[PDB]
Each structure stands twice: as C-alpha cells, then as structure tokens.
Amino acid sequence: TVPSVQTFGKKKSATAVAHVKAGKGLIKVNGSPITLVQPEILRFKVYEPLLLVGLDKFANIDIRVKVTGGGHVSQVYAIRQAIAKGLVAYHQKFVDEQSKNELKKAFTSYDRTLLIADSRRPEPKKFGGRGARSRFQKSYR
C-alpha cells in the first residue's frame, strides 16, 4: 500500500482529522466535497489553502477530513487548518524542503492558523457573575 499522512485541526474544541494520500485529486469533508461544507459564505475559508498553494499540487492527492466538535464556523476553521497541515505533512514526507518553505511563505501571508495551531481557549465561568470576567449586578440600595 502507498504511504499516507494523517493530520489534524483544532479550534476551540472542534477536532478535524485529515488523511492525505497519493491518488487522483480528492478533497472530502466527512463524505462530501469542499464545494459544500455548510455555510456557503465560509466555503472560501476551507478553499483558501488550495488557492494559495496551487490547485495543481492536488493532481496526485487524496484528502479526507473527519470533523467532530465545536459549532460550524469553528469546524470549518479546523478543516482548513487540517488541510493546510495535511499539505505540509505531505511535502515533508514525499516532496522537497524548498517546496515546504514555499508553502509556508504562501500561508504566512495570512497565518489564519493554517500551519500553527491556535491558542485562545475558553476561560472558566466564575461564581458571582454570569460570565468569566463579567460580574453580576451591584444593587447597593
């Protein structure tokens, strides 16, 4: 069997997992194409890495992303991240270091996570307030 690389994508709590193989030109979210994802507006967010790198760099690829958690936007972001990460992983494994560098450069003209996983995770909701930082409502008299 042909070697294939596994990658993931994280945002908030949403977990994407991409599987990059050698093949014809697959790009799949769960069991569907990237031409769907969900919100129609945010279809470009998941499509963006492909646009950046060049669609020809996919003429020998197979991509499948299993996504669980988050909401919708977060999920999309995670998928995008996974795809970017998948590509970079593939380059690391099969292609060349200069190519990897180029890819990184292309990504880092934005750096919307892509190659680097996001920090910024939910802060615990404290007592004496409805929010994490938000205090209750001081009554006085």
């Binding site: 507006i41 669609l55 936007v73 919307r112």
Partner: protein
C-alpha cells in the same frame, strides 16, 4: 483559465485565474487609492483577504488593530445591539450585499468607495470634556488616525442602524446608500452630517 483535473468536482471560477490572482471573493483588492497622504497601516488594504472573516488577535497589542481588513472591521461594527451580538456570518453576508449594491449603483470597485467614505466621514477636530471644574468646557483636540478611522466606521454603521429601525429597507442596501453619500455627491448621509457637526462644535471651542 487552466482547468485542473481532479476526481472531485470543483467550480469553473475556482479553476480560473483565482488560483493565479488571490483577490477577494471575486473582487479587486488592487486599485489602492487613499485620498489623504499615507494613512496606510491605519486603513489596511494590501493583504488580499478572500472573505472578511478572520479569527485573530487584534486587541492584544497597541496598534495591531490596524492589520484588520477594513471590510472585516465594517462587518464587526455592524455586529451590534442585542439582537445581533455575535452572528458574524450575518454581518459578512450583509457586507457582501452592500458591495453588490455598490457595484450595481454608480459602478466602480466598491472597496475604493468604502475607503473614500471612511476618509471623508471621520473628523479632524474633536471635543473632549476637559472640565474646567467639571463644567461645560471642551477644548478642541485633534484626533489620531487609527482612532479617527474607527470612529468613522462606527458612525457609518450607526447610520445604517438608524435607517433600519422600522423600515422596508434591508440593512445592507441602506448602508451602501449611506456609504455612497459619505464618499462624495450629496453628503446628506447621517454619519457624515454628525461628523461635520462635531467638527463645527470643535471649531467654535478651545
């Protein structure tokens, strides 16, 4: 332009030179004309973001707020008042609609129009409650660029909000109209008027 052969179905537009030139969801992020001298890294432009929806850190440094795409900032500003806190997708959609409206009416690249509006609304001279004992004394203070830009954006959004409060006019159309008014032509938009009034007030005071 240059179809890439895949097993998965990809639209024609994507296949075309959108891979080659990375400008917006089918709009020109070029042109690049700021009417005032410099003003760059305060009004962002340059970086050709596809859709005005980026999750990043733009409060964690002093001026890093500038590196937000102007469209994105507009969307964020629109995202306001109870019924719409969060729901950035909606805001993005509205912005897209606004852009479309701009394209339809008086042609041009809408981004440039937006930029013009931002420039020509925002105030040079502003008022602060300095006090003089806490009383009604306000020295005329000139405004910093980034802050001014932000203020202009806010007032633009405010105008749209005002328009929409019980009306047939959907937010986006109204916003577009007011933006156009702000840019040049009539200057009968709310935001611009407000700004001018503020400027006048500043002038009559020191």
């Amino acid at each position: 332009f240059v179809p890439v052969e895949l097993a998965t179905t990809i639209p024609v537009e994507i296949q075309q030179a959108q891979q080659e030139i990375k400008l917006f969801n089918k709009w020109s992020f070029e042109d690049v004309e700021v009417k005032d001298a410099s003003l760059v890294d305060y009004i962002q432009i340059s970086k050709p973001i596809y859709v005005a929806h980026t999750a990043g850190r733009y409060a964690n440094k002093r001026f890093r707020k500038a590196q937000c795409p102007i469209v994105e900032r507009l969307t964020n500003s629109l995202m306001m008042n109870g019924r719409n806190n969060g729901k950035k997708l909606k805001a993005v959609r509205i912005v897209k609609h606004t852009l479309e409206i701009i394209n339809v009416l008086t042609d041009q690249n809408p981004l440039q129009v937006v930029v013009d509006a931002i420039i020509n609304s925002g105030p040079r001279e502003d008022t602060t409650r300095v006090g003089g004992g806490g009383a009604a004394r306000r020295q005329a203070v000139d405004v910093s660029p980034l802050r001014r830009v932000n203020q202009s954006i806010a007032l633009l959004t405010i105008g749209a909000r005002e328009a929409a409060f019980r009306n047939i006019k959907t937010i986006a159309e109204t916003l577009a109209e007011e933006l156009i008014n702000a840019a040049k032509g009539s200057s009968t938009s709310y935001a611009i008027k407000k700004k001018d009034e503020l400027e006048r007030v500043a002038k009559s005071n020191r």
